[PDB]
UniProtKB/Swiss-Prot annotation:
It catalyses: an [RNA] containing cytidine + H2O = an [RNA]-3'-cytidine-3'-phosphate + a 5'-hydroxy-ribonucleotide-3'-[RNA]; an [RNA] containing uridine + H2O = an [RNA]-3'-uridine-3'-phosphate + a 5'-hydroxy-ribonucleotide-3'-[RNA]. Substrate binds at K7, R10, K41, P42, V43, N44, T45, K66, R85. The chain holds residues 27 to 150 of 150 of the full protein. The lineage of its organism: Eukaryota, Metazoa, Chordata, Craniata, Vertebrata. It comes from Bos taurus. Its EC number is 4.6.1.18. This is Ribonuclease pancreatic. Keywords: Disulfide bond, Endonuclease, Glycation, Glycoprotein, Hydrolase, Lyase, Nuclease, Secreted, Signal.
Length: 124
């Protein structure tokens, strides 16, 4: 088992780099983090901020989640993220991704005790 919170850090945290390093980035990371094991995860965002910073978002701006639930929060500041988007030539198990760096507000769903991020909802 892996807790919800550990899963979030696995799928979305990458504080070692401040930006989307290369055009290779998503191809390497999606595989490293086991995001291309059962299929190619269509889209995935990595956050290049400190873990304390991303956790703090749970006390920031409360907004509606895409799914209609209300445990979503938006960062007051923009954060450095990298979006990974599956390409056309991407054919499981040979998943292919486009790497895109950006600075945006992230929206995460939080839960538990302590209240931590468990899902990445959107970036804006």
């Amino acid at each position: 088992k892996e807790t919800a919170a550990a899963k979030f850090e696995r799928q979305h945290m990458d504080s070692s780099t401040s930006a989307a390093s290369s055009s290779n980035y998503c191809n390497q990371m999606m595989k490293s983090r086991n995001l291309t094991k059962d299929r190619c995860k269509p889209v995935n965002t990595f956050v290049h901020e400190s873990l304390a910073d991303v956790q703090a978002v749970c006390s920031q701006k409360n907004v509606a989640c895409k799914n209609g639930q209300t445990n979503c929060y938006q960062s007051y500041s923009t954060m450095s993220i990298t979006d990974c988007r599956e390409t056309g030539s991407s054919k499981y198990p040979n998943c292919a991704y486009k790497t895109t760096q950006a600075n945006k507000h992230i929206i995460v769903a939080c839960e538990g005790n302590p209240y931590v991020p468990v899902h990445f909802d959107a970036s804006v």
